[PDB]
Amino acid sequence: SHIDCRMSPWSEWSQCDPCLRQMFRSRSIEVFGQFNGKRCTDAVGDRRQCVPTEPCEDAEDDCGNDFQCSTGRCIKMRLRCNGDNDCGDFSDEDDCESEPRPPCRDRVVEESELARTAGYGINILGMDPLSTPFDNEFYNGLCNRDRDGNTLTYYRRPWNVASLIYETKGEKNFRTEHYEEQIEAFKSIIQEKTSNFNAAFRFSYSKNETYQLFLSYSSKKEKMFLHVKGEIHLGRFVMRNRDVVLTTTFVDDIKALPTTYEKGEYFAFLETYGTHYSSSGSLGGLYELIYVLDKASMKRKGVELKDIKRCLGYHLFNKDDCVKRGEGRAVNITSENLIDDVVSLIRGGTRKYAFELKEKLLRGTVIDVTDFVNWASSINDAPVLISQKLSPIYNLVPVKMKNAHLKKQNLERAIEDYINEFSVRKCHTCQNGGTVILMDGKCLCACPFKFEGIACEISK
Amino acid sequence: SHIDCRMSPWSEWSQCDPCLRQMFRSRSIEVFGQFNGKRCTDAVGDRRQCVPTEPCEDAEDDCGNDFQCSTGRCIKMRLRCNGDNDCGDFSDEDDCESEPRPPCRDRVVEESELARTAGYGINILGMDPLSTPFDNEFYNGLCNRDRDGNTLTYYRRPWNVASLIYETKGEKNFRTEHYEEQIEAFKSIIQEKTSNFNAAFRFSYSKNETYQLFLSYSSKKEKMFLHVKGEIHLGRFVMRNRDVVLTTTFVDDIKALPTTYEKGEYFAFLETYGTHYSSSGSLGGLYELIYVLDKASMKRKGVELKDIKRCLGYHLFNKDDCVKRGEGRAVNITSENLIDDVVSLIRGGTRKYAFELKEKLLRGTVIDVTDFVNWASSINDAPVLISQKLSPIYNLVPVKMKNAHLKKQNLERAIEDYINEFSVRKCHTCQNGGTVILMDGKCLCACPFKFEGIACEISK
Amino acid sequence: SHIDCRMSPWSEWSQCDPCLRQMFRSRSIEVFGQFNGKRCTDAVGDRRQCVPTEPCEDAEDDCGNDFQCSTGRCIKMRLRCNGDNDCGDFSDEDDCESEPRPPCRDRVVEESELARTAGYGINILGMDPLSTPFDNEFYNGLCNRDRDGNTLTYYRRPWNVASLIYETKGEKNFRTEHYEEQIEAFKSIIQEKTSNFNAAFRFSYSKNETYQLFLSYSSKKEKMFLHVKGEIHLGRFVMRNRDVVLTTTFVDDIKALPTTYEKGEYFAFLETYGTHYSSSGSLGGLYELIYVLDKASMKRKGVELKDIKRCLGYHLFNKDDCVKRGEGRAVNITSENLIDDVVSLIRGGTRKYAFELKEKLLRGTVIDVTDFVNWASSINDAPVLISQKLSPIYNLVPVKMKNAHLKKQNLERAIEDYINEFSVRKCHTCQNGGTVILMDGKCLCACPFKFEGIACEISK
């Protein structure tokens, strides 16, 4: 068992991209390292400076009949001096001596806590970088209020969020399964022959053979299961799809794409800003217990016994003898296996109450209803995204910018190449029911419940 | 078992839509991914910028004999300086030095809490984005009061809400079913033959065969069920159908539709603003317990026994022998299955009392009547929509705007295409009673009560 | 089992209605969706803008010798400066410098709480939108007092209410039925033959056959029922039929009817303002318990037994044998079903006492007489309509307006078409006693007490 990492050879140098003065080249990954071998360490993509031999046109947008700002975002004239940071670099609340004319008037209006990070541009592994391509500070001069249940406030709705409810949806699943199987097998045998021959001046011949045999098999098995899962949802959100504003640090990174399907830059872009964006989330976070017991007793026995009681004797003078032989054997074999797994997981909430709750779960005693309530009041402060409906990031690249369809054509294939080349289906699978897991480019396998070996080979 | 996602090829590029300068093209989805395969990730619809080769007419409404505003909504002259935000951008309470003449006079008149979000533009999955196409701030210079039971106030009726009652309709269902079936089968057999032959100088021949057999089968079964469901309704609402005002961020998105049935834009519109709007809701929210027990004991036995007691002996001299043989067998097999499911769900109410109530339900002890009362007083703050009578969103697109019937003809087919192409009837169904569920474009199946496999195959 | 929704094809485009500049067309619904199929979603009626090719006359009323107002209601000269909002837009208390001359003088006179919403324009489903076609602010310069029992005040009688009493009519029904049936059947059989034949040097032949049989059947059944129903009535009302004033937002919607029996607009009108108006109601609200128990025990047994005891033996030398055989069988089968349903419902009253009362009902303990009294004092605040005598809405369209009889001829057939096309008698009925219920255009069936299937097929 010895597998090492591998690399494909590099490709050819494509072209000096004239709008970036760099030629790119790339390669792929054949086989990731496995079974205590060398790690691949993500060495795809390469860059090299070159002089532009044939210069491109000046790639800048027209920004027709709109006030250009000091960032690159083009806003309208209606957003002038509105008291809202619309250009990004505060190009409204400085210029004029006119009225600030706030569209949210003297009504009690605050800033939100859930809508401001409403992108959660997610990656296909499952973890979510908050590198939001959206900009949740652009209000576009509107004042739409969305109520809160507990605090009785009036939060705002940013322009990129199309809907934002605050329900209170608590939901506890609970299961406990139980299996048991006893079996007691049993087999006894007793045999006996007693032969006696007598002549008549005589001759005798006796034999008393007494065989016995005995076998038991008293084996039980047991297999429990338990599963608590209590979700707590506080609302949701749904993002938009047309006339969407993007943040400042993202339009530039789309504008710096090599436009010719150069493979090196897109694998950096898709891990800087994620693969998909959560177009419809649901905040508030869960907890979970799992209690997998397992038991396997076994007995087996054997009780064996033999006897021969011979004799002889005759009067003619006298002669006699008496012979005895007796053997006994016994075997007891009592085996036992026992396994207990406990897993607990808990997401969301303040640091002080959630880790009271986790240990009150794992103690096994009953939890008085003051810690789940305190954690559920805590979850308003620190929400954790729990369920999302994805959407690809090339459904977000704007069309106003130059070479938009070519960059979308690049990003629609880069996601296929990213999901293919880092897939788990390149490492050869582990035997004995071992589930292979790609991690750090090093396919580690998890063995079920009995196998301590890396290849799930050694048993107990 | 290995299914991956599939895609149809793209269509042809239709036409530069001259009023939007973009040509659209699209495709469909053949088979969603299933059984631990690649996800489809919603890649329908495509956009591309193009120069308008043949320009359209200037698509703007006439707004005949009405005061146009700084949003696009056309109000009447009666709404001038009324002290109500009718244009959306406050084009009443700024202009004149005349009287504000409030139609709600010095009577105690407030703003509502249930009517202001009275659209709940819903989607066919079951969840409800609050992206209200209606505008519940337009009062049209009228003062219609609707009373409250508990607080004794006088809320208003916005123009888009046609009726709004506040009942107090509490309604608890409760069920508990119970099934049980014991059975005890039993079968015993005893056999015996005793033969004895004697001559007469003699010869004997004996045999004592003693067979026995014994079988039990003592199996019981049990299957409980419980179901609490206590709804609490606080009123309802019924929206209108003619002379309806729409919000500012929705008439623009209808005006930006490609008018030629271009499939890419309508699938973004129908998931920005939902598929249907709740034309008749009922607020106030439920809770629910479900307690599905299951039990299956089983015993079976077997007790077997054999015996042969032969003999022989004669005087002529003497000879005799006595032979004994005896076998015994026993099997006990005692199996047991047990399953407990508990589900609890709770909607509506403040964060502090509802999650006291849920754990007081799941404890199993009796709940003193102070937590259901406190949750029911809490439900006035945070209502949750509970029952609705839908209506399609192409019964809402106004007819005053240009190309209204063509856009309604597009939206009446886009709902059929949306309900067909994301239907569950494309994924091949799971066996063993597994109910397939479309989720994230990845058809996951739920297996009933015994099957841990993805295809519901492995049993216990 | 697979039924989907269906639609008839659309009709022909009728005519540009010249007073509304819109041609209408429509269709019908053949079969609603049923058994987990596609929903119809109410797609009847259609509108389309068209230029008026032949213009109609200016549809406005004469309003002969009456002061026209700024709404469209024509009041008399006697109502000038009376201090009552008669035109709707306050065209009395602004103009003159004369006396306000209130017809209710310095006597203690208030505004009502039950008469102000005295329409309750109801729909044929059973639920009641408060979209009152009547106007319960028009007093017509009269001062008619109607007393109150508890508060000792003097409420007013609006012109649309012809009579208004405040009784106090409490009425509790109570039932408890009980059925029980035990039966114990029993059948035992014992048989025996003992034959013995002896010769005489001999020969014997014996036989002792001993059969037995035993059967029980000890099954009981029980079926309880309980039904509390305590109504509490506080008064009633009776509306008028001639010289009736209607509200401002209803004469316009009658005036916007297409006049040619165009089917699309009337199905929106009849669900904006209901099908009938409650011409004679009775306020104050009920509560209700239902306790349906069900039990079905069953036993059955069987105890079977057989025996053959043969023998033979003769002296001639000697020979004999003895043969025994004995079988035993036993079956016990003990089945049990149990069902408990509880339903509770409660209408009317403040939020704090009614939901104390509901849980004091469902606890099963006796309720001390302090919660029913507090709920009955609460019911003065929040009444709920409980019994009504309907009347069709085309007995309410005024005759002064133009094309009144044609619109009444349209509305007298639109109610027949509405009650026919959304009737439950289009969905094919469910078997096994399943009652079909039309809901959301999706005929769901309810199965009685044992059947969990959608088509009431699977039993227990």
Ligand SMILES: *[C@@H]1O[C@H](CO)[C@@H](O)[C@H](O)[C@H]1NC(C)=O
């Ligand atoms: C994958 O690994 C897990 C780890 O415990 C194991 O339980 C499971 O049986 C493996 N196989 C599959 C198909 O999930």
Ligand SMILES: *[C@@H]1O[C@H](CO)[C@@H](O)[C@H](O)[C@H]1NC(C)=O
């Ligand atoms: C669908 O899945 C559920 C999940 O438990 C199962 O109970 C049910 O039998 C399945 N089939 C149908 C027809 O609902």
Ligand SMILES: *[C@@H]1O[C@H](CO)[C@@H](O)[C@H](O)[C@H]1NC(C)=O
């Ligand atoms: C209708 O459905 C109900 C639901 O329980 C059932 O009790 C009744 O027998 C059905 N049939 C009729 C004729 O009411």
Ligand SMILES: *[C@@H]1O[C@H](CO)[C@@H](O)[C@H](O)[C@@H]1O
């Ligand atoms: C990467 O590219 C270099 C270019 O010189 C090769 O030499 C190397 O073997 C690898 O393919």
Ligand SMILES: *[C@@H]1O[C@H](CO)[C@@H](O)[C@H](O)[C@@H]1O
């Ligand atoms: C989408 O459309 C492109 C257009 O070039 C095709 O090449 C592709 O195969 C897919 O159909």
Ligand SMILES: *[C@@H]1O[C@H](CO)[C@@H](O)[C@H](O)[C@@H]1O
């Ligand atoms: C509705 O009416 C249209 C009119 O073109 C038909 O094409 C359609 O089939 C339905 O009947």
